[PDB]
């Protein structure tokens, strides 16, 4: 059983592109090869890490379940969850964002140190995706996150990396000079993944508990 992604790539579908989610809803498939990676495949420009490896892991998935790993209206009381929208990810003429990611911003002039962990209790491999914002100028960095020494740390038993977003003025792609780089890992049943940051974190919203056999 295939997946039939249509005009959408794997990166767009798994991230929750507003133009993609309108046609996909399966559980037990076997084929996924529909559209290769495009520089316009994600609604916000950026690099998708280990893309070809993710294509192999999602091959012949026997069980698929999308679940809210971090509730939007309950996980980030000291941050704004409503302003993370952008014209590059427009839906029906209004600025939107990824259906599975959450762009956190400052609240009341502060971006407090956030620390959010999640214990895998689904008895399946949980695919967790997130992003890191690389702004186009220091003004945007100060406006959205206040701090200029921003770090994002993501630690689990299989994954451990400290990201330091760099301010880079890049060629205009999809009306964006900045970028969000996308990362992912496979959380083991019973393992804990910890997200810590003081800015630039595109936090996970929905994750995927899957099985390939």
């Amino acid at each position, epitope marked *: 059983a295939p997946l039939q992604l249509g005009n959408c790539s794997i990166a767009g579908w798994i991230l929750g592109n507003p133009e993609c989610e309108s046609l996909f809803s399966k559980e037990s498939w076997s084929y996924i090869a529909e559209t290769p990676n495009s520089e316009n495949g994600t609604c916000y420009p950026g690099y998708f890490a280990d893309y070809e490896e993710l294509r192999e892991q999602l091959s012949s998935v026997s069980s698929f379940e999308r679940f809210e790993i971090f509730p939007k209206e309950s996980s980030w009381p000291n941050h704004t969850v409503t*302003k993370g*929208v*952008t014209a590059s990810c427009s839906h029906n003429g209004k600025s939107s964002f990824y259906r599975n990611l959450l762009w956190l911003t400052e609240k009341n002039g502060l971006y407090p140190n956030l620390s959010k962990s999640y214990v895998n209790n689904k008895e399946k491999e949980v695919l967790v995706l997130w992003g890191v914002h690389h702004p186009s*100028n220091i*003004g945007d960095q*100060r406006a959205i996150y*206040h701090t200029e020494n921003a770090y994002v740390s993501v630690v689990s038993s299989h994954y451990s990396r400290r990201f330091t977003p760099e301010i880079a003025k890049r060629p205009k792609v999809r009306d964006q000079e900045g970028r969000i780089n996308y990362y992912w890992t496979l959380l083991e049943p019973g393992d804990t993944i910890i997200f810590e940051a003081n800015g630039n974190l595109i936090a996970p919203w929905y994750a995927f508990a899957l099985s390939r056999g």
Partner: antibody
Amino acid sequence: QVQLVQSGAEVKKPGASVKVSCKASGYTFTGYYMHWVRQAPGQGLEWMGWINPNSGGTNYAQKFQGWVTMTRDTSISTAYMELSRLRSDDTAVYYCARGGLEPRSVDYYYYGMDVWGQGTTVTVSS
Amino acid sequence: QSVLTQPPSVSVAPGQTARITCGGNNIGSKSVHWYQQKPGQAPVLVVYDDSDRPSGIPERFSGSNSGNTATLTISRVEAGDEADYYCQVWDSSSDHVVFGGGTKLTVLG
């Protein structure tokens, strides 16, 4: 009733310093940026910079950096503006304004000014 | 700091429609705010977020923002509308708040 009330008019000799005050009421002082704008007689508005009352952080305009210092007293909800080494061109009205307009997207994450103070006239003459 | 270009003066007969433009680089992708300043008084916000009005401002004041020009429209101008009008946008590339040069609206009564 959001209101900003500034200190009275001042006269100063060239080379002196003056500290203008801007009292805020009707909202939480630390929840919004406080801007400062200068207008010379018959001239346009000139942005001088803003201060974050919550953290104390500042962002000065290039033209006013150096001889201009912004502070705030959270206990009394009052954001200060000190001018250094005044000259005759500094004769102007000085307003404070609150960044109460909420941004809608990260594409333009900027709190626009809504409520202005009445203005403080500073006259510099020898 | 990126520049905002306003016409210095605009004249209009009473009851007609006054239009004040604010030109800027890619201003259509930013939320323009307009301020009204009468002689001897502090500025007053009349239009925010391109085309929205605060409570107390009559519906005669309107706004638009597309491309490289933002427009502040005043329909059925009255004598009391004589003031200086300023646009304001934030320039992310400099982290500077920028004011337009200011437009003096004279109603020819």
